[PDB]
Structures are given as structure tokens and as C-alpha cells.
Design a protein around this ligand. Sequence first.
Ligand SMILES: Cc1cc2nc3c(=O)[nH]c(=O)nc-3n(C[C@H](O)[C@H](O)[C@H](O)COP(=O)(O)OP(=O)(O)OC[C@H]3O[C@@H](n4cnc5c(N)ncnc54)[C@H](O)[C@@H]3O)c2cc1C
Ligand SMILES: Cc1cc2nc3c(=O)[nH]c(=O)nc-3n(C[C@H](O)[C@H](O)[C@H](O)COP(=O)(O)OP(=O)(O)OC[C@H]3O[C@@H](n4cnc5c(N)ncnc54)[C@H](O)[C@@H]3O)c2cc1C
Ligand SMILES: [Cl-]
Ligand SMILES: [Cl-]
Ligand SMILES: [Cl-]
Ligand SMILES: [Cl-]
Ligand SMILES: [Cl-]
Ligand SMILES: [Cl-]
Ligand code: NA
Ligand code: NA
Ligand code: NA
Ligand code: NA
Ligand code: NA
Ligand code: NA
Ligand code: NA
Lengths: 292, 296
Amino acid sequence: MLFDVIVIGGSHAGQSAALQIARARRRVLVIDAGARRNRFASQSHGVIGQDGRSPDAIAADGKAQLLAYPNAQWREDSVVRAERSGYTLICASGQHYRACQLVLAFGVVDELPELEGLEERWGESVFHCPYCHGYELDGGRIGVLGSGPLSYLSAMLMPEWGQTVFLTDASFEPDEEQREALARRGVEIVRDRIARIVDRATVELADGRRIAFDGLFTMNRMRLSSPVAEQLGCAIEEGPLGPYVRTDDAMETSTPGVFACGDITHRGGTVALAIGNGALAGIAAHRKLVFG
Amino acid sequence: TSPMLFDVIVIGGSHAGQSAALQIARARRRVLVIDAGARRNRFASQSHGVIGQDGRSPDAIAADGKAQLLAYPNAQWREDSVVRAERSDGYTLICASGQHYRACQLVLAFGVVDELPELEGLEERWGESVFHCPYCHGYELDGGRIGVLGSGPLSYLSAMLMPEWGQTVFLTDASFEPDEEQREALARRGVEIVRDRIARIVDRATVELADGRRIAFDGLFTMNRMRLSSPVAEQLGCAIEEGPLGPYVRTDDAMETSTPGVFACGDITHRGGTVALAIGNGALAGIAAHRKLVFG
Ligand SMILES: Cc1cc2nc3c(=O)[nH]c(=O)nc-3n(C[C@H](O)[C@H](O)[C@H](O)COP(=O)(O)OP(=O)(O)OC[C@H]3O[C@@H](n4cnc5c(N)ncnc54)[C@H](O)[C@@H]3O)c2cc1C
Ligand SMILES: Cc1cc2nc3c(=O)[nH]c(=O)nc-3n(C[C@H](O)[C@H](O)[C@H](O)COP(=O)(O)OP(=O)(O)OC[C@H]3O[C@@H](n4cnc5c(N)ncnc54)[C@H](O)[C@@H]3O)c2cc1C
Ligand SMILES: [Cl-]
Ligand SMILES: [Cl-]
Ligand SMILES: [Cl-]
Ligand SMILES: [Cl-]
Ligand SMILES: [Cl-]
Ligand SMILES: [Cl-]
Ligand code: NA
Ligand code: NA
Ligand code: NA
Ligand code: NA
Ligand code: NA
Ligand code: NA
Ligand code: NA
């Protein structure tokens, strides 16, 4: 099957891109594996129009609106191989598809420290993004898990949402500079080894003592969901927390005819930005179909 | 009356301003939106191209967003127009009502105003059968007949694009004359050129030419000029640059203008023209404005 564009990933970025291509009366296929990065929280925040709505509902509304266009197609599957040919995609199911252009919108995967109790609380009481989930902590106690330079900056912003403690876990020991800057912002440093997280977000130390937090934040590392960008030769840069696919102003990668949007690009990390640069990418892809 | 000091005031309360204000509200800071109630998109019955809001009424989109923002008790709204902005030892905004408001930082989100050509009947049909943006309204023309009202060199590229959505006539109207490469290009794309002067637009979408001929269209497009809705950006000393279709307020990667503590978002910035873009860079502006409150 030949399409004008195939969009790999059918969450916020992919749907936004696909909608532009559909509205341009071109034949577009979304191939989506169905595991969004935000499948862990009960509510989304920060997107005007969708504030406080469930992520499942946001994603379903968008799928419904895209598929109102009969020239848009959907397939629940995973792309395992992409190659120049236009482009040919091979899916985990064994199905092959072809397209003149591609839009990469497959997202990133969060990689968490190996701390007993932490991962089961992801999106419930342990978070990455204070604009996304800080407000609902209601000014209570917040723990920031230390893990390098960006943790220190996060801890310095976090007092906006509640009383903040920087937790070193007996590993990430701040230097003189970092240390003095925390003390001025009123951020306590706790250096004890953490054995596990219990209850809502209570840190239990190796010596048994507990520190009860209302929420924990981590500036955790992220990986690309798929090797498809690397297969296609798309330039990938290494950010402080993980890789992203390079793009220009029109969201085009270093590989002509392959565009990228959402969390896999440099300005990502939120739904608002996924929607915005997804739309840029979809319009750009269409413009390249017409003018080259 | 009791004194108020807002961490941020957002001037303009449509897509861009609401998106910015929401970030600030979620950062537990005090935010005021002052909005004059005249969105650029107050003429069309449906909005398109924003995933989640595709095909919904602009009025409903605006109302839903306003209600969501005002659910935060640290967010406030005023239906007013800022007539003057000045720097003090933060910022003071003077409104048409005579009310004054005080802010530490500002987000400009006041949009642009479409400057339509003086063609009889065109303004009456703006947002009904006459449009600016083909991604916004091309699809609903259903492969119909489309007229591209000539406005100069930029109308040529529009005419070359429009066959994606329907059978296209380039109404050059003495504003443009294709050379040879361009006439061949239009011809290869299946675009008809009509050179006679346009007298009038009548009925729903019929072009009435100087010689008396009538051409019925299903929709018309104009690559019209736009101006900033307010002099507030200039009052604040914000650098303004001339774009191909009108001026924009200059912004850096953090959506900050040349004036520290004044940010901008939406159609008044270099990348605009759509709601999706307004929401995206409004969110950038709100987060950036918050970050400056904390770190300077
Ligand atoms: C716990 C948590 C809470 C969050 N809360 C918020 C919030 O409140 N507000 C906010 O703005 N942001 C929030 N975020 C960030 C937000 O989730 C992302 O910014 C957003 O989901 C990015 O959208 P995306 O389309 O780029 O990728 P994703 O939403 O991750 O979607 C990627 C899609 O591509 C698919 N895919 C992956 N590989 C393949 C393949 N090989 N073939 C086909 N399909 C594939 C996946 O299955 C998935 O469906 C949160 C993140 C987390 C972790
Ligand atoms: C007919 C038409 C149809 C369109 N359809 C679509 C579409 O379907 N999809 C799409 O994505 N885009 C569409 N657009 C483009 C879209 O309207 C804009 O991109 C978008 O509205 C810009 O958002 P904004 O918040 O920057 O500005 P606006 O939506 O214009 O809002 C600016 C607000 O600021 C207020 N304001 C102005 N001056 C002051 C002041 N001095 N003090 C206080 N408040 C002030 C105004 O009253 C207004 O409420 C359309 C445009 C037009 C003209
Ligand atoms: Cl998060
Ligand atoms: Cl790249
Ligand atoms: Cl970058
Ligand atoms: Cl005051
Ligand atoms: Cl404060
Ligand atoms: Cl328009
Ligand atoms: Na949201
Ligand atoms: Na992601
Ligand atoms: Na994103
Ligand atoms: Na609109
Ligand atoms: Na409302
Ligand atoms: Na003409
Ligand atoms: Na805009």
C-alpha cells in the first residue's frame, strides 16, 4: 500500500501532524503501537481546552477527529524497520507499507532510577514535570531525587509548589557552589541512603526513618522509543537527559522527506508543544509534497 | 478598593493569552488576563486544524478555555482594553475603562487585525466565503471552484498551492503579471488566470468583473496584510520587525521581547497564523515568564 505520508506514532504529535495532511486532502496513514508516555496519570494539565481531562480521553477525541477524514487511515501496530526505497516500513505484524514521506512521532521512554517502590508510583505521586503535576500537591512537602546538574535547578524551582527537600541518596553530593545556592532558596539537603518509597510518597531510609512527602520529582533520563530515526540516518543529538532527533524550522530531519515532532525533538516534553510542532510538521510535509 | 499586584498580566485572552496564563496559574502565581473580546476568528462558524478541537465553534473553544483558566482562584479576568502600558520601579496598565492594573511582568497576546483590500462586498463575506488560510478552510470547499484574489508576488505561491483543494482561478486584478516560467507553472498546475479588474463581490461568492462578467466561486482567498492590534508593544519599547504581510513583535527562544520582563505570543510573533501555533508558543511564553519570576 502506498500513502502520501505515514506518521509513526499516533499520540498528540502524530495526530496533530496527520490532521494537517488529512485536511490537505492527501492520503495519510498513522501506525501506532498504543503506549503513550502519559498513560500513567489520571489527568493531563497545561493544555488550554484539555486542562484536567484524562489523557485517554484527549487521545481518543483526537483519533476520532482525525478519522472523520476518510483519506486518513489508522493501524495499531509497531514499525520495526524503515528504509529508503520513497520509504518502506516493516511492522512487527509482518505488514509492509510504503510512503513518499514520513513523520516521526513515536515519543520517548522514561528511564527511572532503580529505587524500590518508585516506578509503581510513576504518574500518581512521582513525576517529572512540575507544570504538569505540581499544583495538585497543594503546597505540601516535595522531594527532589538528586541525579546531576538539572536536579539542582529543579530543586531551586520547586519551592514554587511546596516545601522542597533535595535528596542525594548518599550518592549525588553537591559541591560548595550548589550547596550554598540551595540553602538560600530554603531547600533542605538530605544525604541519607534511601531503602524504598512507601505509602503515597514517603521516603524510607536504610536506617528505617521515614520522611513523608506529598510528591517526588525526578529529572530522569529518557530514550527514543524506536530506532527508526537512526535506521533512516536522521541526525541525533545527545541532550543532558537523553537523545533527540535534530530538526530545522520546518521540523524536517537531516534525511529529506522525513519529519519529526513531539517529545523526540528538542522543544518537547509537553502536550502543548507536541500539538504545536506536530502541526508545523504536518504542514511542512504537505508543502514538500507540492513544491518538493 | 483593595490594592492588587499581579505576578503577570496577559494582554489578550484568546488562544495565545489563555495558554500563557494557564501555565502561570499552574505555577501558583497571580495572573490577570485583560481581554477586549474581539478575536481574529470571530467570523467563521467552525475552527479547524487543532487536534481535539477540530470542527468546534471558535466561541465554544474560547469559552471552554476561559472556564478552565478561571477554575484556578489565583487567575483573574477583566473584560477591558489596555490603552497604555508603562514601566515603573514592574508595569502599570491603563485601560479604556479608567481602571489601572499593576504587574511584575507582562505577556503580550493581543493578536493582529486583518486589513482587507477595498473590494466592494469582500468585508461582508469575510469568514463566510472569503478567507486567508487554506489549511484552515480549504477542505470544506469540497473540491469546489476557488478564486485567489491577486495581491502581488505572494498570491502566486497561493495560487500554485490551491489546486490541492479545488479548481483554482488566479484573479490577478492588475496586482501581478506572471512572466513565462510562472505562466507555464500555473498552466501545468491547472490554474486559470483571469486578468480583468474586479468590480464587486455579490451574492454568496460571485466575482463581478469590470467588463460585467460574473464568475461563481465556492470560496475566495486573499493573502491580505495584517497589523498589530495594539500600540502597547511599541509603548513598552519592544522591537518590531516588518514581515512580508505586516509587522511582528520580535521574540527570542523564550518568547521574550527586547524589553526584559515583557513576553509575546500568538499571531503578533514571527511564527503565527494558526491556533495550534498560538497554543504552543503561548505555553512557552507562560513557562518562560514564570521562570523569570523565580530566577530573574
Ligand atoms: C507521568 C507523566 C505525566 C505527564 N503529564 C503531562 C501533562 O499533564 N501535560 C503535558 O502537557 N504533558 C505531560 N507529560 C508529557 C507528555 O506525556 C508528552 O509531552 C506527550 O505525550 C508527547 O506526545 P508524543 O506524541 O510526542 O509522544 P507519546 O504521547 O509518548 O506517544 C508516542 C506514540 O508513538 C507510539 N510508538 C512508539 N514506537 C512506535 C513504533 N515503533 N511504531 C509505531 N508507533 C510507535 C507509542 O506507542 C505512542 O502511542 C507527562 C509525562 C509523563 C511521563
Ligand atoms: C476568518 C478566519 C478564520 C480562521 N480560522 C482558523 C482555523 O479554523 N484554525 C486555525 O488554527 N486558525 C484560524 N484562523 C487564525 C486564528 O484566528 C489565529 O491564528 C488565532 O486566533 C490567533 O490567536 P491569538 O490569541 O494570537 O489572537 P486572537 O485570537 O486575535 O485574540 C487576541 C485577543 O486580544 C484582544 N485584545 C486586542 N487588543 C487588546 C488590548 N489593547 N487590551 C486587551 N485585549 C486586547 C482581542 O480583543 C482578542 O480577544 C482564522 C483566522 C480568520 C481571520
Ligand atoms: Cl510528569
Ligand atoms: Cl535529524
Ligand atoms: Cl535545538
Ligand atoms: Cl498594588
Ligand atoms: Cl510569590
Ligand atoms: Cl482564514
Ligand atoms: Na492538559
Ligand atoms: Na513521549
Ligand atoms: Na512534546
Ligand atoms: Na479558529
Ligand atoms: Na467561559
Ligand atoms: Na481579476
Ligand atoms: Na498564532
